[PDB]
Design a protein around this ligand. Structure first.
Ligand code: PTY
Ligand code: LMT
Ligand code: LMT
Ligand code: LMT
Ligand code: LMT
Ligand code: LMT
Ligand code: LMT
Ligand code: LMT
Ligand code: LMT
Ligand code: LMT
Ligand code: LMT
Ligand code: LMT
Ligand code: LMT
Ligand code: FMN
Ligand code: RBF
Ligand code: SF4
Ligand code: SF4
Ligand code: FES
Lengths: 446, 194, 349, 211, 11, 189, 25
């Protein structure tokens, strides 16, 4: 503890968190139809179990995992299946994907949940498989199944459960409100995780730019001992698992290794809240919290949205587009993607619905690199982005891999501090995609 | 096999050596003449033909002094009588030592000064060469009796000799060499003065 | 085509950097121009205009967009070359230097960010080598509006054409005077007692280059540049520390032969080279240890060629040598990654 | 057999296409007359060596192929030196070491080892003559482009170096010119050579596009 | 398809 | 002292920038750093041994017998011979060693530097120790220049050099500028 | 003469050395 800070890089972008983190979490009227993609997680894609025209209740297991590394899909609301086919996906390409379409009946009747009894009584494996049959996908961006992470963590020895409450992305305030209003729930979820993984204490960390969240967390968790609330600095690449681990524990996650090596596990606050809900009440992951902000939105807010709700309904709920949105990002400005259209659904990993106007989007006129070395002074991983970009532009991906293309996390600190405006992150993404394509080809060859 | 590998190499070396020897026996003669003629051409630029009769590069002296060390005085005798003596002087300049030649007559009057070797920066102190400026031709009537030991310096130090625009170290070295040569001739009488 | 992130920026630009560097150079350039007068102004104007025009022509030939002219990469080089030249120099000296730098040194390699050598110092070295007489004629300070400096048309005849200046308007500086007097079998103390004052040399009351003369306004500009986070303190700190330490050691060893410390600092283009010229981003290391090595080597070479060399100042030569050595330093002193040791293999825990 | 002569001048140049024999190209080039003299000496030695090797082609055991040939080359070089030290001493003093440094001339040995071993005497001789004319052309173009920039004058002291009969080549360009000193110096050689290489590239591309 | 979609090199 | 002589040979009297010796392999192999380093080490070793052997042959065979005009021939022959040995003995006695020194040895057999340096030594009339030091200095200067020009050419391989100058012409221009930068060491030693 | 014999001796020594080296290695 007693954070080492360091980080060895980082930027201070405009937070813009004061225009949305005022109102409480709103609610959505039930939209007519929901589009649920069958791949809302990492790894394999779940297989459907219902047919067209079937009647399902709120919480039914529409799709099941084909392998260990997957996650089921649960019906957000009671209704009738109308399509098991192609649906638009929340991807920059705009291509379609396999997915179900559910017509909202409007009754909104819950299924007979399999509630547990005395959650602090059972062995860790039973709780882990209960989480597995809950749809938890780790709503922090990595969309990785929480059950696999917990099962792997139980194998080793864990000395600390680190709740990643440091929402660092600009314009995003979902974590702030979810921690202000659900402090008891997040503390109980942290306790349940600490029981699942035999550990010592939880070190729940929040950034210093959220005094209300810190006060609420400290008020909620002061009678139970090992629970701790920590104040990390206000840095952009601070929510990352590796950077937060280095800041709190003081060690470094070895390259090509997992967080369990240093005996620390990282979970987002929304993921821990979902785990707490699943363990205490048996409710699967059906809805989450998203942040709608930007200069083109009449009323920025945080909305509790069902999975599969179209983006257009979300925009209409918050008043409407008060002008022409130059960009419609899905997530923070440093990692968001351009939405092809407003009919795209909301996957479990969707974090924001930013509507950036012209005055918020900086102009960029690319120029030759002047080798000012401002990239090296901002990279959290201590790489040399200029050399990586030079080798990627020359199609020498092998040379770029030597300079740190393997360890890059695409945080976007490169292009933020570039005098001659260069899309360094675009180069890195293109090089990684080319490496993945070559790897796929050569693997198929075998 | 080993037959070719050594036989052909030895044969090449032997035949080529023989041909080179046949060339040497012819060219060794004519190369010495060319080098001696080059030496005479360099010497003649400061010594007019009428003054000397015998061959200057046949009776070269070797004189020890107290400062310069060993000298290479070449006499120029018309009829058993010394008329001019040609020697060389060395002095540290800016880019390195400067080797110049002096051809001073039997009465102490300088008959001409030429700079043989120098490594000064071109375009700034290259005027010492007689093919670029007439400055080196200043020492043509001066001696140790019409110029006391106050005018044998550049104008910067209070003398009578002009200095190059932007370069004074090289003229200082040349004037010092000329003065030292004249004083060396004055010290060693008879065999150098007559 | 789809657009990639991030969608945020810090409003930085190359134009702002170059304009800030020019603004930092302005207080010393004004002091230099006022002290020497109209010929200095004419030389500076000619050098800057020639730099801009030749950059425009080179951009037109190579096909690059004309917006590259507006980033200040050529105006800064012209400014540095003009302030690095003798004050009362002919126009063709400045024009030739500008053509040799913007051209061979910068545009022949592709443009900004591609050249491996410093353009301004390359032009200065080429001018010194090609024309030694015109680059070693230092005019005494003749302040503007002083009743002794030439008028506005006499100064035009001085700068353009070839009218000889005067008998008595040209003197010797400090380093060259010290070396000459040492070659005149005088000890290294008598020379500095009656031929050098530190207070006047620090203010800038001595003959020298156009902007080199003042070692205080340059220091203020460099400090402001460091506080603006445009340059890194490693190179200036290393250069100044190395030169001062070597000079002090030499003075302590042989006081009657070596002069060091204040004399070495307040003489020549050491401060200007350390702050504004050796900190060229395109031709400097990108690491911290690399920058420290760059600065230490620059200082050592500058002092070595100053003391035992054949030049009175070798800031340009040291900078060019270290620019040549830069790529090896870049490829052998890369910063440590995350979760890896210095050698690069993964950490063990 | 004349086709090789017409091809070795521009299509395959010893120092402009094959990137060989750069030491004499860059060192003895300060005057056009020096370049012409070096080029002609190299042409003479090339012709003689090539002819001798072609005549003695049917042997030269491959395992010892290098030194043997070097031997022959060395002979024709050494004799050459001892000729021009005895009857062209004024030219010999200027060239100095590089007249002796023809044994290691990469172009000479490469052409010897690449053509002479598989061709008759006359094609060998013609090839050598073409290579030497190409070398001479390069050493005259670079020599002139450096001399003009350094002093303004074209071929100079030809009456002394190459004999009074070649006085007619003494022509002055840009009278009343002090010249740029950098062209004579070593930095002036590499830049001029690079510019000539780029000009050759450009003219070749223009011809190819016209084709 | 989506799994075969990859980024285009920046201009 | 010997340190001043070595430094002067390396910097003040560099065999390439102000000597114009061994330019063809220097401009043909410097595209890649590892071959440049290998050839630099190999040529340093070969030039040192060649200088030592040339001095021994000149002061023990050529001069006592009265024949000097054969010198060039003798020198090259000996050196060539020696190089061949230094090559083939490396092939299988240390097979791992034939990846950094042996592969590049064929080149330096005829380099104009292994021949240039000994003749220059001959002109100055150096002794055995001075000849060996001169050879090693010339070698360490050839290295110091190749292992510095390779870096620049590799930096420029990834640059944006115009299509009319990419490759050899830009290398020649960079070499000219590097010689103009080395010119500052003149007269220091 | 005393010179040609020495030249031939050095030549045959180099030839025998290279031949033995090629044979053994
Ligand atoms: C005139 C005497 C000057 C004396 C003083 C000179 C002092 C300064 C020297 C400056 C020389 C010029 C520097 C500017 C070069 C700009 C290059 C622009 C880009 C480029 O490569 O353009 C190409 C140049 O033409 C070529 O590639 C052809 C070039 C042919 C050169 C022939 C002259 C050889 C002699 C040079 C001696 C210099 C000595 C200097 C001491 C043609 O455009 P591109 O094909 O790249 O277009 C691509 C678009 N698609
Ligand atoms: C990369 C770091 C290199 C560190 C180098 C440190 C060694 C250099 C300094 C010690 C040598 C000082 O060298 C001393 O100075 C003078 C010039 O002042 C050198 O040079 C002097 O002699 C040479 C040879 O004749 C000529 O150029 C001229 O006469 C003069 O310049 C001398 O050889 C020596 O007397
Ligand atoms: C891009 C275009 C070129 C810009 C750079 C050149 C600017 C003009 C420089 C011209 C220089 C000519 O050089 C100088 O000319 C001026 C007038 O100009 C002459 O001046 C002459 O006319 C002026 C009035 O016009 C009189 O006051 C003066 O007494 C008389 O001498 C100078 O005697 C001469 O030394
Ligand atoms: C990018 C900026 C470039 C700036 C270029 C400026 C070029 C200026 C050229 C100056 C010309 C020579 O300068 C001039 O020389 C001549 C004779 O030599 C004399 O001047 C005489 O001829 C010039 C024309 O050449 C007439 O303008 C002048 O009235 C007359 O007196 C003066 O000395 C000086 O006016
Ligand atoms: C090598 C790096 C620098 C590259 C240099 C590019 C070449 C630039 C020109 C160099 C010319 C050198 O030659 C130089 O010619 C100029 C004309 O311009 C002559 O100049 C003469 O006439 C001009 C008018 O035109 C007057 O301004 C000048 O005062 C007078 O001397 C110089 O007396 C001579 O020294
Ligand atoms: C931005 C607006 C303008 C700001 C600049 C205001 C002017 C500043 C520059 C003034 C410089 C001239 O001022 C001074 O003039 C005198 C003679 O007059 C010169 O001559 C002398 O002055 C100094 C004064 O200490 C003497 O010690 C010294 O022996 C000698 O250099 C100086 O070298 C020069 O420094
Ligand atoms: C009497 C003559 C004295 C000449 C002095 C010349 C020294 C030049 C530099 C002056 C000092 C500048 O002061 C400098 O301020 C910067 C402001 O970011 C500090 O900060 C600097 O280092 C820190 C780490 O230590 C970095 O994280 C930071 O990015 C960098 O800017 C430096 O630690 C300090 O060295
Ligand atoms: C390595 C990084 C730099 C370290 C610091 C470098 C400082 C500058 C170099 C200092 C060099 C001193 O150089 C050396 O000075 C000594 C002084 O003892 C001179 O020595 C001379 O004077 C001393 C007394 O002072 C006599 O006893 C001695 O017999 C005589 O030779 C040497 O001839 C000279 O070689
Ligand atoms: C710049 C940042 C790094 C600073 C590092 C400081 C480390 C060294 C500290 C001890 C330095 C002592 O430095 C000492 O100062 C004296 C004045 O007292 C200076 O000496 C000064 O006055 C003497 C006469 O008194 C003059 O002959 C001399 O030219 C002048 O510089 C010298 O430079 C040095 O002899
Ligand atoms: C021509 C003159 C040349 C001058 C050359 C100067 C010597 C340079 C070579 C020796 C360098 C040794 O470089 C070695 O690098 C390691 C990292 O690998 C440094 O390690 C450390 O350096 C600095 C210490 O200030 C820290 O800020 C840095 O974070 C850390 O890496 C060691 O402190 C240093 O010993
Ligand atoms: C790596 C960094 C190393 C820094 C340098 C440290 C070593 C410095 C050695 C030089 C020490 C002084 O060494 C010696 O000093 C003498 C007298 O003092 C000076 O004086 C020299 O000048 C003349 C010509 O100017 C020379 O011909 C002569 O050899 C010598 O007298 C020279 O500079 C140097 O020959
Ligand atoms: C952006 C750059 C703009 C460049 C503008 C240049 C304008 C001036 C053109 C160059 C100077 C022409 O001025 C020149 O003057 C000299 C005498 O001084 C005379 O020229 C004479 O000397 C010059 C010296 O280089 C040579 O051309 C030649 O030896 C002879 O013609 C001519 O009058 C004219 O060639
Ligand atoms: C890595 C870079 C290293 C730089 C070089 C190391 C410093 C070298 C300094 C050499 C200084 C030469 O200094 C000059 O030379 C002579 C001999 O040549 C020195 O002489 C000194 O060393 C010689 C040789 O060991 C002694 O015999 C002598 O008693 C002593 O005085 C003088 O002090 C000076 O006149
Ligand atoms: C650039 C970047 C930004 C990140 N921002 C956050 C964040 O704001 N909140 C968070 O919890 N994790 C953040 N992370 C890390 C992961 O999203 C998450 O912490 C971990 O990988 C999986 O946690 P989960 O299992 O709780 O989803 C970030 C990572 C990177 C690389
Ligand atoms: C801090 C700093 C220093 C600079 N120094 C120089 C310099 O010495 N010479 C130069 O031509 N440009 C200099 N520039 C301008 C820029 O670096 C120049 O365009 C590149 O060297 C061109 O390749 C400098 C710019 C900055 C920001
Ligand atoms: S995107 Fe990759 S290279 Fe760039 S700063 Fe982030 S981790 Fe470093
Ligand atoms: S920030 Fe931009 S200009 Fe600076 S080194 Fe990195 S890529 Fe180059
Ligand atoms: S290396 Fe000298 S000619 Fe090839």
């Amino acid at each position: 503890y007693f954070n080492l800070s360091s980080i060895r890089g980082g930027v201070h972008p405009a937070a813009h968190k004061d225009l949305s983190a005022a109102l409480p979490i709103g609610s959505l009227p039930l939209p007519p139809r929901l589009y649920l993609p069958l791949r809302q997680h990492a790894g394999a894609e779940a297989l459907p179990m219902v047919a067209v025209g079937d009647k399902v209740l709120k919480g039914q297991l529409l799709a099941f995992p084909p392998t260990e590394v997957s996650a089921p899909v649960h019906a957000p609301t009671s209704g009738r299946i109308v399509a098991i086919g192609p649906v638009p996906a929340p991807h920059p390409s705009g291509l379609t994907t396999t997915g179900i379409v559910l017509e909202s009946d409007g009754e909104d009747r819950w299924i007979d949940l399999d509630v547990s009894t005395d959650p602090f009584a059972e062995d860790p494996l039973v709780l882990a498989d209960r989480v597995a049959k809950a749809g938890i996908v780790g709503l922090g961006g990595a969309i990785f199944p929480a059950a696999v992470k917990l099962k792997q963590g139980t194998r080793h020895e864990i000395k600390t459960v680190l709740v990643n409450g440091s929402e660092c992305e600009p314009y995003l305030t979902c974590d702030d409100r979810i921690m202000r209003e659900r402090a008891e729930a997040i503390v109980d979820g942290a306790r349940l995780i600490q029981h699942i993984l035999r550990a010592y204490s939880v070190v729940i960390a929040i950034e210093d730019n959220k005094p209300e969240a810190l006060a609420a967390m400290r008020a909620a968790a002061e009678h139970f001992g090992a629970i701790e609330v920590m104040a990390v600095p206000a840095l952009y690449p601070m929510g990352s698992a590796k950077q937060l681990i280095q800041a709190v524990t003081g060690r470094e996650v070895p390259a090509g290794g997992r967080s369990t090596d240093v005996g620390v596990l990282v979970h987002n606050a929304g993921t821990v809240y979902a785990i707490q809900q699943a363990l205490r009440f048996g409710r699967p992951l059906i809805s989450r919290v998203v942040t709608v902000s930007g200069a083109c939105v009449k009323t920025p807010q945080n909305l509790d949205v069902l999975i599969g709700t179209p983006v257009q309904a979300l925009i209409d709920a918050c008043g409407g587009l008060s002008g022409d949105p130059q960009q419609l990002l899905l997530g923070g400005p440093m990692m968001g993607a351009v939405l092809p259209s407003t009919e795209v659904p909301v996957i479990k990993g969707a974090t924001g619905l930013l509507a950036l106007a012209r005055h918020e989007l900086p102009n960029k006129d690319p120029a030759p690199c002047i080798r000012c070395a401002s990239c090296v002074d901002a990279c959290p991983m201590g790489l040399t982005p200029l050399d990586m970009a030079l080798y990627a532009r020359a199609d020498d991906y092998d040379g770029a891999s030597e300079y740190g293309l393997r360890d890059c996390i695409l945080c976007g600190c490169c292009s933020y501090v570039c005098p001659s405006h260069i899309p360094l992150v675009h180069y890195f993404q293109y090089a990684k995609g080319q490496q993945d394509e070559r790897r796929s080809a050569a693997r198929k060859s075998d | 096999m080993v037959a070719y590998q050594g036989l052909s190499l030895g044969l090449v070396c032997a035949v080529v050596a023989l041909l080179l020897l046949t060339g040497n026996i012819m060219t060794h003669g004519t190369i010495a003449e060319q080098q001696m003629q080059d030496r005479l051409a360099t010497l003649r630029e400061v010594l007019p033909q009428s003054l000397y009769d015998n061959n200057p590069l046949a009776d070269s002296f070797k004189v020890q002094d107290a400062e310069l060390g060993e000298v290479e005085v070449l006499p120029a005798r018309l009829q058993g009588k010394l008329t001019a003596v040609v020697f060389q002087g060395r002095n540290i300049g800016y880019g390195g030592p400067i080797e110049q030649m002096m051809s001073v007559d039997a009465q102490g009057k300088i008959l001409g000064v030429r700079v043989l070797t120098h490594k000064e920066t071109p375009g700034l102190a290259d005027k010492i060469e007689a093919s670029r400026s007439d400055w080196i031709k200043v020492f043509d009537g001066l001696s140790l009796e019409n110029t006391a030991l106050d005018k044998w310096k550049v104008k910067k130090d209070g003398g009578q000799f002009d200095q190059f625009a932007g370069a004074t170290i090289t003229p200082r070295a040349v004037v010092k060499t000329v003065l030292q040569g004249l004083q060396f001739q004055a010290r060693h009488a008879e065999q150098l003065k007559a | 085509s789809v657009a990639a992130g991030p969608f945020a920026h810090d409003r930085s630009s190359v134009n702002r950097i170059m304009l800030d560097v020019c603004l930092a150079l302005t207080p010393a350039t004004l002091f230099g121009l006022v002290m020497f007068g109209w010929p200095a102004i004419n030389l500076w104007l000619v050098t800057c205009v020639s730099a801009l025009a030749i950059e425009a022509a080179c951009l037109r030939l190579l096909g690059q967009p004309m917006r590259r002219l507006l980033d200040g990469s050529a105006l800064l080089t012209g400014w540095l070359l003009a302030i690095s030249l003798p004050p009362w120099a002919p126009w063709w000296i400045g024009v030739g230097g500008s053509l040799f730098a913007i051209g061979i040194g910068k545009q022949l390699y592709g443009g900004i960010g591609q050249n491996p050598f410093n353009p301004a110092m390359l032009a200065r070295v080429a001018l010194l080598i090609a024309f030694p007489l015109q680059m070693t004629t230092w005019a005494l300070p003749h302040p503007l509006f002083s009743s002794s400096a030439p008028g506005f048309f006499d100064s035009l005849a001085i700068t353009f054409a070839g009218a000889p200046l005067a008998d008595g308007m040209t003197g010797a500086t400090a380093l060259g005077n010290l070396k000459t007097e040492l070659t005149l079998n005088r000890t290294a103390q008598e020379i500095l007692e009656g031929g050098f004052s530190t207070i006047s040399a620090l203010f800038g009351s001595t003959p020298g280059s156009l902007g080199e003369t003042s070692e205080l306004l340059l220091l203020v500009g460099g400090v402001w540049l460091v506080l603006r986070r445009i340059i890194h303190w490693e190179i200036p700190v290393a250069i100044l520390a190395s030169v001062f330490v070597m000079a002090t050691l030499a003075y302590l060893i042989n006081p009657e032969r070596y002069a060091g410390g204040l004399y070495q600092l307040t003489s020549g283009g050491l401060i200007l080279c350390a702050f504004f010229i050796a900190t060229d981003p395109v031709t400097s290391p990108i690491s911290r240890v690399g920058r420290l090595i760059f600065g230490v080597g620059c200082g050592v070479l500058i002092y070595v060629i100053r003391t035992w060399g054949s030049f009175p100042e070798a800031a340009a030569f040291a900078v060019l040598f270290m620019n040549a050595l830069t790529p090896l330093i870049d490829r052998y002193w890369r910063p440590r990654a995350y979760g890896r040791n210095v050698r690069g293999k993964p950490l063990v825990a | 057999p004349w086709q090789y002569f017409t091809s070795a001048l521009w299509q395959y140049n010893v120092a402009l296409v094959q990137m060989l024999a750069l030491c004499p190209t860059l060192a003895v080039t300060t005057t056009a007359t020096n370049g012409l003299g070096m080029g002609l000496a190299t042409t003479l030695v090339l012709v003689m060596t090539n002819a001798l090797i072609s005549s003695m082609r049917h042997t030269i055991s491959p395992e010892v192929r290098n030194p043997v040939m070097i031997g022959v080359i060395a002979g024709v070089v050494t004799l050459t030196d001892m000729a021009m030290n005895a009857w062209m001493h004024e030219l010999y003093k200027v060239l100095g070491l590089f007249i002796a440094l023809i044994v290691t001339n990469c172009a000479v040995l490469g052409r010897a080892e690449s053509f002479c071993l598989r061709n008759p005497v006359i094609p060998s001789i013609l090839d050598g003559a073409g290579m030497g004319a190409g070398f001479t052309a390069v050493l005259v173009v670079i020599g002139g482009i450096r001399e003009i920039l350094g002093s303004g004058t074209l071929f100079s002291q030809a009456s002394s170096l190459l004999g009074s009969h070649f006085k007619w080549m003494e022509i002055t360009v840009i009278p009343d010119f002090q010249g740029i000193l950098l062209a004579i110096l070593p930095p002036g050689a590499f830049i001029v050579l690079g510019f000539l290489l780029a000009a050759k590239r450009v003219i070749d591309r223009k011809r190819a596009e016209r084709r | 398809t989506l799994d075969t979609w990859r980024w285009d090199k920046p201009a | 002292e010997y340190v001043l002589f070595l430094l002067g040979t390396v910097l003040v009297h560099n065999v390439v920038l102000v000597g114009f010796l061994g330019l063809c392999p220097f401009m043909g192999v410097s595209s890649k750093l590892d071959p440049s380093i290998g050839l630099a080490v190999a040529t340093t070793l070969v030039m040192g041994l060649g200088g030592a052997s040339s001095w021994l042959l000149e002061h023990y065979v050529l001069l006592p017998l009265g024949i000097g005009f054969i010198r060039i021939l003798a020198y090259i022959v000996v050196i060539a011979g020696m190089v061949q040995l230094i090559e083939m003995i490396i092939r299988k006695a240390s097979p791992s060693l034939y990846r950094s020194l042996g592969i590049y040895l064929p080149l330096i057999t005829t380099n104009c530097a292994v021949l240039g340096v000994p003749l220059l030594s001959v002109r100055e009339g150096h002794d055995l120790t001075m000849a060996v030091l001169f050879g090693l200095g010339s070698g360490l200067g050839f290295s110091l220049i190749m292992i510095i020009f390779a870096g620049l050419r590799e930096r420029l391989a990834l640059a944006n050099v115009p299509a009319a100058f990419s490759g050899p012409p830009i290398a020649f221009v960079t070499a000219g500028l590097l010689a103009l930068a080395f010119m500052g060491f003149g007269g220091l030693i």
